[PDB]
C-alpha cells in the first residue's frame, strides 16, 4: 500500500481525539457528538443554543486559542426534520490546528449570529441568509449580498431548481429590462449514473 | 420454531432450512456479485463469482448453490474471497471482446459494473482473443455471441419458464457455443425476456439498437394496456420520445417478465396518429379544421339528439376516465345506450355483482391450486403471463391442467377433455372421470375465457360453468374463502367498463340504431354504416386512424396510454394508474378533457374540472376504481348461481375454438399493434 | 452521391431533407444549405475485401494506437464476409 | 409543540407589525413614485401594495408571519436606498407578460396545460 | 510543406476557403434527423 | 322521470354494512326477479360506508346513508327509491 | 420563556418564492425506483425518491432540440423513509401521491431439485 494509497497520520488523530474528549468534558451543556474522521479532522457537532458559548470558549481558551474563522456555511438535507445543518471551521494559529463546529437549523427557527465573537461571520452568515433562507438573530446589517435585489426565493436549497423560475430580457415597447417565465431553447438533460452495485462496503448502512 | 442460527461477518441472523448462502448474506443487506443465479431461475453454479470464504474452512464455496448449516460464519470482505473475485473477474474478460462503446449493454452492463467494483484495474492476457460466429434466432433479439460469457441463463430460462427447449450449448471446452445448432428462429411469446436477462450484451433489442444510452433516458413507471393482465413497465424516454419499454417488478402479477407485444408495440405507437380534428367537406373527405368547429358542430348535432337516438361504443384501450365522462355525457341527455366491443353475457345476475365477471381467485392465486381447468380459450396467446403462472405452477407446485376447447399448444401438457360443451353438461352431471378428480381437489379452480363467450351461445356456456363451480365449491372440501369461478378477460378496458355500468355488447345499438354514433377508439369494426341508418353521424375519439376512422363525420384526435394519466382495472379487479411518459402530437388533448370541453360547449357542463375530481366522480360510481394496487374481493356467488339458473339458454353444436390458434394470430390485435413495423416482420417471419 | 430534390434541395447522407410545403425552407433564401459531398456509406463500399488464410482476423483500423480498439472477426461463415464493427473494412477467408 | 419565537410570541404582535410595515409602505409608495419617474399614478402602487399583503394574507403562524415581514422590511429599505432601479420596481407589475387564460376552454384550446 | 508534406487523401479539400461569415456561402444551422411521428392520411374517396 | 339505475356500495368486514349484507344474501335474488331492466350494481370495498346511490332521467342522482342499519330498514329506502321515481 | 406554543400545521408555501401555479396544479409522487431490469444490483432501490408529472416538451424550430418550460422538470429529491418525504410534500403545499415499496419475496433455492427421481422440476440440460 506504499505508492498509490495516502499515507495515514496516527499521532494527529490520537491528539485530535484527545482535544475532542477535552472540549466535549468542559461543555457538556450543549456538545452531542464528538468525531474524528479517517483524514484527521475533528468534527463537534453541538445544540444550537450553545452557538456563542462554546466558538466564545474556542476562540478565547488558553489550551484552544482559535482565532481564525475560516469558512462558515449552511448545508441543506430535505429528509431531516432539521434540514439546515451550519459548519463553522475554525483555524488556531498558535497550536496550528483546524476544527469545525456543526450546529442545525429549520426553515423557522433563528440561529444566534457570532459576529460578536468573529467578525468575518457578518458576510459570511448575511450569504448564508441570502442563499438558505436561515435567520440569524442579533445581527447588525442582515440583508441579501449576491442574489438580484428582487429576487423572491433561496437558490442553494436543494428543492430549488438548477434554473430559476424567471429569466431577464430587454423589451423595446416598455424600453426597459423584463422579468418573465422561465423558458428554455435545450432543457437541462438529467443523466442518472449512479452505479447499481455497491462500492464501499464499510460505509453499509443496516437494514430496516 | 426450525430456523437456524448463522453468521454474516460476525453478525448473527436467523435462516430458515434450506437457505442459500447468497440469500442468508442478502438478510444483512449484502449482494454478492452473480453472473448465472437468477432469483426466478434454476441453480447452474457455474460462473463462479461468488466465491465466498466461510470462515475455518479451507475452500471457498459457491454462495448461490451451498447451503448453509449452524454455526457457519461467512466472510464476504476478507482477503481470499476478494481474490477469488479478482481471478474470477480475469478470467471472464480474458477472451470478452473490446467492444464496450458499440455495444447497447455500456452503462448498464453488469460486466462492467462488477468489473469496476469487485475485479483488478488492467489485463495480463498476452494472448489472442477468440471470435464466435452470430446466430439468426429472429428479429426480434439480435445475437453477438462473441460477447457471451456462457452464463446459460437462456438455456435455463427458454427451458423452466417459456418452456421452449430449442436453446442449447454445442462443443467442449472454449469452444462451446450457446445456440440452436441450426438455423431456427426462437419465435415465443416471451422471446424479449432473453434480452433482460442476458447480463452482457449478447442478446440485445433489435428494435432499440444503436438509438440511446442507459444514463440519459428518463423513467417513468406505468402500466401496460396491451392486455387485461396489468403488466407493469417502465417507459424510458429521451428528449420528449419513447424510446423503450421495460418491465416492472410485481411479485403478484407479472413477476418480472413481459410479453412480445407489450414489448414492441411503441414503434406502431408512433406512427399512422390522429394530429389534427378532421370534418367533412361538401365533397365528403374529411380535412383539418380547429378545436372549436369541430366541437360545435358535434355539440350542435347532440343537441338536437334526445333518448336511444344517441349511443356510444367502448374500444380495447379506452381509460376509466373518458368512460365516465361519457356515461356522465350522454346520461344528461338522458340516453343509457352505452356498450362496448367486448360481448359479456347480461342473462341472470349480469354485471351486477362482481364475482360472475372477474377472475376470482387471484393472477397469484394459480400457485395455490392444485386442478385448473380451461374451457374454451388459448391463455398462451391472450394472457401470456397467466399462462406463465400456470406453467410455473405445473413445474413447482405439480399442478393438473386440464382444457376444453380446441388442443392448442401451451408449453406443457395437459389433459384435451374434448372441444364440445357437452363435456361441459358432462361435467355437472358426474358422468366423467374429471368429475371424480375435481371433487378429489382441494382447491379447484375452473377458468372461462372470454372469447368463449362471444359465441351466440355464450350465456349457455356461462351457466354451464357455473353449475360446475358452484357443484363444487358447495358440495366438495372448500373452505370457503376459496374462489372457484373465474373469467379470463383480454381486452385492457372491460373491466373498467363492466363495473362503471356499461352494457356489454353491440345488441342494443343493433335492436334501435340511433342517429347520432359516439366511438371512442371503437376500432374493432363490430358496428358499421350498413347497421346504422342512412344519414348517421359518427364522431371518433382516438389516437390511432384504423378501422373506425375512415367511416366517422368528426374525428376528435385523443391521447395513447402513454401520453395521459389513465385508470385502468385488470382481469383480477385491481385498478392501476399509468402516468404521462410523453405528450400528445400535434393538436392531440387528453380523452376526458374532450368530452369535458364537449360538454361545456353544448351547455350540459359536467361537474369536474380537475382530473382529482373526475377520480372523486369516479370514486362516487364504484369505490374500488381509486384504490390503486389492491384487489378486494367478491362474494355472492350463490345469489348469481341462482338468477343465472332461471332462463335455460341452449347449447350450440359448435366446438369451442379460440380465435388464436397461432403464434401468428397473436401479434396483430388492435389498432397499436396493427400500425407497428416490428408486429409487421414479427408475421412475416413466423409465416414464410 | 449526393443527391436532389423537386424543390431543388440537397439531400444529406442522413437523408433529410425539408418538405416543399414546410415554411423552415425560408433560411436558406439567399443563402446556402450546407451538406457534405463525401457519403462514407459510398466510400467504404468502394474498398476491396482483403483475404486472408485464417479462421479469425484482427482488425485495429491501421496505425496501431491511432486506430480503434483492437478487435477479433470470425470467418466461419462462407456466404457472407465479416466485417468490422469500427471501420466498416471486410475480410473474407482464402478457403 | 414549543418552538422558539423569531420576534412576536402570538399573532397580536406578530398583526401589530404587519400594520406598521403597511403604514410605512403606504408612507413611500409617492416617493418612489417620484424618485424613480414611474409611469404609474399613486394609487396603482398604494393598490399594488395592499394587492401583495392581502395575497399574503391566510397565514395564521406567528413565525411565519414574522420572517415574512421581516422580508418586506428588507424590500422597503431596499427601495428607501437608491438600489432597486426603475426595472426591480417595476417588476411588480406584469406589462410584458401575457394574460394567462383562466376557464377550461381556453386551457383546452392553447395546450395541454391543466 | 515543401520539405514534409502533409499525406495525401481523398476527402481532403483540394480549395481551401476563408472565413465566409457575411457572405451568401455563410452556414446556415438546421437539423440533420427526419420527422419522428408519421401523420395518417385520410383516404380520399367518399364513405358513401 | 323515472329511475335509471341503483348503486349499493357497501364493505365485505366491517359492522355497519351487516345489514346491507343480510339483505342482499336474503333478498337480492327476488329483488332482481321483481326489476330484471334495472341495473343494481353491488359493489364491494374494503373500508367504504354503505351507500345507496340512485339515478334518475338527465342525470339526476339522490344519496341515501345506510350507515348501521338493519335488512328491513334498508329494504325500505329501496322500496322508497323504488317507488319515488323522481 | 423564551419557547412559544403553535398549534397550526407547518406550511412554508409563503417563504419558498414558488409561483402559485407550480404549487397547485402540480403532482408530487412518492415511490421507491424499480430495480432496472438489465442489471442485477439492487443499490438503486434503497432509498425514497420524489419528483413531479412530466409537462409538455417540443421541438426547437431552428435545431430541433428538446424545448421546455417546466422549471420542475429535473427536480428530483431524495429521503431516508416515507415520512420524512411525506412531511416534506405537506410542509411545501404539494399534493402528493405515495406508492408502498415492492420488496421480492423470498424463493426456496435447492441444487438438489434439478435431479429429482419423480418431479417435473428436472432438467433437461445443464
Ligand atoms: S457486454 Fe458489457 S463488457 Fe461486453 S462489450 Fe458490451 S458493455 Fe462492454
Ligand atoms: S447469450 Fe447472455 S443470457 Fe445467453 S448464455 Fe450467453 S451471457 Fe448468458
Ligand atoms: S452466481 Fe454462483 S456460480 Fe454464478
Ligand atoms: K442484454
Ligand atoms: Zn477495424
Same mark, same amino acid.
Given at each position: ?208 | ?11 448473527? =441472523? ?117 471470435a464466435?460466429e452470430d ?123 413481459? %410479453? ?114 380451461? =374451457? ?150 363490430? =358496428? ?40 385502468? =382495472? ?70 348469481? %348461481? ?47 | ?43 467504404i463500399a468502394?474498398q476491396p475485401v482483403s483475404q486472408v488464410?485464417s479462421?479469425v482476423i484482427?482488425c ?13 472477426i470470425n470467418l466461419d461463415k462462407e456466404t457472407k464476409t465479416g466485417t468490422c464493427g469500427?471501420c466498416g473494412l471486410q475480410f473474407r477467408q482464402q478457403h | ?114 | ?48 | ?13 366491517? +359492522? ?19 326489476? +330484471?331492466?334495472? +341495473? ?9 360506508? +354503505? ?36 | ?126
Open positions: 500500500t506504499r505508492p498509490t494509497v495516502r499515507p495515514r497520520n496516527d499521532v494527529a488523530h490520537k491528539q485530535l481525539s484527545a482535544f475532542g474528549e477535552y472540549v466535549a468534558e468542559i461543555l457538556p451543556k450543549y456538545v452531542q457528538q464528538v468525531q474524528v474522521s479517517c483524514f484527521s479532522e475533528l468534527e463537534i457537532c453541538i445544540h444550537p443554543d450553545g452557538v456563542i458559548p462554546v466558538l466564545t470558549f474556542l476562540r478565547d481558551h488558553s489550551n484552544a486559542q482559535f482565532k481564525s474563522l475560516a469558512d462558515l456555511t449552511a448545508v441543506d438535507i430535505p429528509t431531516r426534520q432539521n434540514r439546515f445543518e451550519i459548519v463553522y471551521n475554525l483555524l488556531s494559529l498558535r497550536f496550528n490546528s483546524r476544527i469545525r463546529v456543526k450546529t442545525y437549523t429549520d426553515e423557522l427557527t433563528p440561529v444566534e449570529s457570532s459576529v460578536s465573537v468573529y467578525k468575518a461571520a457578518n458576510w459570511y452568515e448575511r450569504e448564508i441568509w441570502d442563499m438558505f433562507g436561515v435567520f440569524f438573530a442579533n445581527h447588525p446589517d442582515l440583508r441579501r449580498i449576491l442574489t438580484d435585489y428582487g429576487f423572491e426565493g433561496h437558490p442553494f436549497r436543494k428543492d430549488f431548481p438548477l434554473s430559476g423560475y424567471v429569466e431577464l430580457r430587454y423589451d423595446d415597447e416598455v424600453k426597459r429590462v423584463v422579468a418573465e417565465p422561465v423558458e428554455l431553447a435545450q432543457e437541462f438533460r438529467k443523466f442518472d449514473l449512479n452505479s447499481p452495485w455497491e462500492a464501499f462496503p464499510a460505509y453499509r448502512q443496516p437494514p430496516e | 420454531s426450525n430456523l437456524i442460527e448463522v453468521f454474516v461477518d460476525g453478525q448473527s =441472523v436467523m435462516v430458515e432450512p434450506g437457505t442459500t448462502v447468497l440469500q442468508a448474506c442478502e438478510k444483512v443487506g449484502m449482494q454478492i456479485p452473480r453472473f448465472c443465479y437468477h432469483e426466478r431461475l434454476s441453480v447452474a453454479g457455474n460462473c463462479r463469482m461468488c466465491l465466498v470464504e466461510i470462515e475455518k474452512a479451507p475452500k471457498v464455496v459457491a454462495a448461490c448453490a451451498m447451503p448453509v448449516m449452524k454455526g457457519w460464519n461467512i466472510l464476504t470482505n476478507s482477503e481470499k474471497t476478494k481474490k477469488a473475485r479478482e481471478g474470477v473477474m480475469e478470467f471472464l474478460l480474458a477472451n470478452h471482446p473490446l467492444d464496450c462503446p458499440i455495444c447497447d449493454q455500456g452503462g448498464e452492463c453488469d460486466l462492467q459494473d462488477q468489473s469496476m467494483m469487485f475485479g483488478s484495474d488492467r489485463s495480463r492476457f498476452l494472448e489472442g482473443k477468440r464466435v446466430k439468426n434466432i429472429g428479429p426480434l433479439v439480435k445475437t453477438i455471441m462473441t460477447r457471451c460469457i456462457q452464463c446459460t441463463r437462456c438455456i435455463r430460462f427458454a427451458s423452466e419458464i417459456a418452456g421452449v427447449d430449442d436453446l442449447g450449448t454445442t462443443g467442449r471446452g472454449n469452444d462451446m457455443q450457446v445456440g440452436t445448432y441450426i438455423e431456427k428462429m426462437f419465435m415465443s411469446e416471451l422471446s424479449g425476456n432473453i434480452i433482460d436477462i442476458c447480463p452482457v450484451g449478447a442478446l440485445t433489442s433489435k428494435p432499440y439498437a444503436f438509438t440511446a444510452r442507459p444514463w440519459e433516458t428518463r423513467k417513468t413507471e406505468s402500466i401496460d394496456v396491451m392486455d387485461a393482465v396489468g403488466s407493469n413497465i417502465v417507459v424510458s424516454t429521451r428528449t420528449g420520445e419513447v424510446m423503450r419499454i421495460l418491465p416492472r417488478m410485481h411479485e403478484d402479477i407479472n413477476e418480472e417478465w413481459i %410479453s412480445d407485444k407489450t414489448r414492441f408495440a411503441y414503434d406502431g405507437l408512433k406512427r399512422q396518429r390522429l394530429t389534427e380534428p378532421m370534418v367533412r367537406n361538401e365533397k365528403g373527405l374529411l380535412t383539418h379544421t380547429t378545436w372549436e368547429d369541430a366541437l360545435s358542430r358535434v355539440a350542435g348535432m347532440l343537441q338536437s339528439c334526445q333518448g336511444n337516438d344517441v349511443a356510444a361504443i367502448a374500444g380495447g384501450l379506452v381509460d376509466a376516465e373518458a368512460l365516465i365522462a361519457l356515461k356522465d355525457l350522454l346520461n344528461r341527455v338522458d340516453s343509457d345506450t352505452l356498450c362496448t366491443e367486448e360481448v359479456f353475457p347480461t342473462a341472470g345476475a349480469g354485471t351486477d355483482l362482481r364475482s360472475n365477471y372477474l377472475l376470482n381467485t387471484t393472477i397469484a392465486g394459480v400457485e395455490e391450486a392444485d386442478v385448473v381447468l380451461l =374451457v374454451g380459450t388459448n391463455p398462451r396467446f391472450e394472457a401470456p403471463l397467466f399462462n406463465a403462472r400456470i406453467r410455473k405452477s405445473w413445474l413447482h407446485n405439480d399442478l393438473k391442467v386440464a382444457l376444453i376447447g380446441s388442443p392448442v399448444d401451451l408449453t406443457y401438457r395437459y389433459d384435451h377433455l374434448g372441444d364440445s360443451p357437452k363435456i361441459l353438461q358432462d361435467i355437472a352431471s358426474g358422468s366423467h372421470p374429471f368429475s371424480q378428480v375435481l371433487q378429489e381437489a382441494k382447491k379447484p379452480m375452473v377458468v372461462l375465457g372470454s372469447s368463449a363467450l362471444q359465441r351466440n351461445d355464450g350465456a349457455a356456456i356461462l351457466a354451464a360453468v357455473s353449475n360446475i363451480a358452484q357443484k363444487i365449491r358447495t358440495s366438495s372440501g372448500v373452505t370457503g374463502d376459496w374462489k372457484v369461478m373465474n373469467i379470463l378477460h383480454r381486452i385492457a378496458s372491460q373491466v373498467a367498463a363492466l363495473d362503471l355500468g356499461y352494457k356489454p355488447g353491440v345488441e342494443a345499438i343493433r335492436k334501435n340504431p340511433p342517429k347520432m354514433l359516439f366511438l371512442l377508439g371503437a376500432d374493432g369494426g363490430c =358496428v358499421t354504416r350498413q347497421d346504422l341508418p342512412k344519414d348517421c353521424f359518427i364522431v371518433y375519439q382516438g389516437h390511432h386512424g384504423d378501422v373506425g376512422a375512415p367511416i366517422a363525420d368528426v374525428i376528435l384526435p385523443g391521447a395513447a396510454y402513454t401520453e395521459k394519466s389513465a385508470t385502468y =382495472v385488470n382481469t383480477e379487479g385491481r385498478a392501476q394508474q399509468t402516468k404521462v411518459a410523453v405528450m400528445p402530437p400535434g393538436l392531440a388533448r387528453e380523452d376526458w378533457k374532450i368530452i369535458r370541453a364537449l360538454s361545456e360547449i353544448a351547455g350540459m357542463t359536467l361537474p369536474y374540472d380537475t382530473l382529482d375530481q373526475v377520480r372523486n366522480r369516479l370514486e362516487e360510481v364504484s369505490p374500488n376504481l381509486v384504490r390503486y394496487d389492491d384487489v378486494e374481493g367478491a362474494n355472492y356467488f350463490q345469489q348469481a %348461481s341462482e338468477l343465472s339458473k332461471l332462463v335455460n339458454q341452449q347449447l350450440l353444436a359448435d366446438p369451442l375454438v379460440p380465435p388464436q390458434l397461432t403464434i401468428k394470430d397473436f401479434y396483430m390485435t388492435d389498432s397499436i399493434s396493427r400500425a407497428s413495423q416490428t408486429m409487421a416482420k414479427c408475421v412475416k417471419a413466423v409465416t414464410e | 452521391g449526393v443527391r436532389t430534390s423537386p424543390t431543388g434541395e440537397k439531400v444529406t447522407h442522413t437523408g433529410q431533407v425539408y418538405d416543399d410545403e414546410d415554411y423552415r425552407r425560408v433560411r436558406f433564401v439567399g443563402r446556402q444549405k450546407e451538406v457534405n459531398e463525401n457519403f462514407a456509406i459510398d466510400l468502394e488464410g479462421r484482427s485495429d483500423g491501421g496505425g496501431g494506437a491511432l486506430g480503434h480498439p483492437r478487435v477479433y469500427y | 409543540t414549543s418552538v422558539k419565537p423569531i420576534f412576536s410570541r402570538d399573532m397580536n404582535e406578530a398583526k401589530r407589525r404587519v400594520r406598521e410595515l403597511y403604514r410605512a409602505w403606504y408612507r413611500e409608495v409617492p416617493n418612489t413614485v417620484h424618485l424613480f419617474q414611474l409611469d404609474i399614478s399613486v394609487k396603482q402602487g398604494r393598490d399594488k401594495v395592499r394587492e401583495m399583503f392581502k395575497k399574503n394574507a391566510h397565514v395564521t403562524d406567528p413565525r411565519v408571519v414574522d420572517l415574512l415581514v421581516i422580508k418586506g422590511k428588507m424590500e422597503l429599505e431596499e427601495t428607501i436606498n437608491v438600489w432597486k432601479q426603475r426595472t426591480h420596481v417595476m417588476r411588480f407589475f406584469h406589462e410584458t407578460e401575457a394574460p394567462r387564460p383562466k376557464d377550461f376552454l381556453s386551457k383546452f384550446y392553447v395546450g395541454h396545460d391543466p | 510543406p515543401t520539405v514534409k508534406p502533409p499525406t495525401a487523401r481523398k476527402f481532403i479539400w483540394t480549395n481551401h476557403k476563408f472565413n465566409l461569415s457575411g457572405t451568401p456561402q455563410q452556414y446556415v444551422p438546421y437539423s440533420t434527423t427526419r420527422k419522428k411521428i408519421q401523420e395518417w392520411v385520410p383516404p380520399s374517396t367518399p364513405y358513401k | 322521470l323515472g329511475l335509471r339505475e341503483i348503486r349499493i356500495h357497501l364493505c365485505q368486514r366491517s +359492522p355497519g354494512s351487516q345489514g346491507v349484507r343480510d339483505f342482499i344474501e336474503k333478498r337480492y335474488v327476488e329483488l332482481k326477479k321483481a326489476n +330484471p331492466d334495472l +341495473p343494481i350494481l353491488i359493489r364491494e370495498c374494503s373500508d367504504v360506508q +354503505p351507500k345507496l346511490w340512485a339515478r334518475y332521467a338527465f342525470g339526476q342522482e339522490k344519496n341515501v346513508s345506510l350507515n348501521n342499519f338493519s335488512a328491513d330498514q334498508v329494504t325500505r329506502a329501496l322500496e322508497n327509491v323504488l317507488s319515488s321515481k323522481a | 420563556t423564551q419557547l412559544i406554543t403553535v398549534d397550526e400545521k407547518l406550511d412554508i408555501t409563503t417563504l419558498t418564492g414558488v409561483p402559485e401555479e407550480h404549487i397547485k396544479t402540480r403532482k408530487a409522487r412518492i415511490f421507491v425506483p424499480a430495480r432496472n431490469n438489465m442489471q442485477s444490483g439492487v443499490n438503486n432501490t434503497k432509498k425514497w425518491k420524489m419528483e413531479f408529472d412530466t409537462r409538455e416538451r417540443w421541438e426547437n424550430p431552428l435545431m430541433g432540440w428538446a424545448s421546455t418550460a417546466d422549471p420542475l422538470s429535473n427536480l428530483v429529491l431524495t429521503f431516508s423513509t416515507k415520512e420524512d418525504a411525506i412531511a416534506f410534500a405537506e410542509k411545501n403545499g404539494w399534493s402528493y401521491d405515495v406508492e408502498e415499496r415492492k420488496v421480492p419475496k423470498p424463493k426456496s433455492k435447492s441444487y438438489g431439485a434439478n435431479f429429482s427421481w419423480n418431479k417435473r422440476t428436472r432438467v433437461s440440460t445443464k
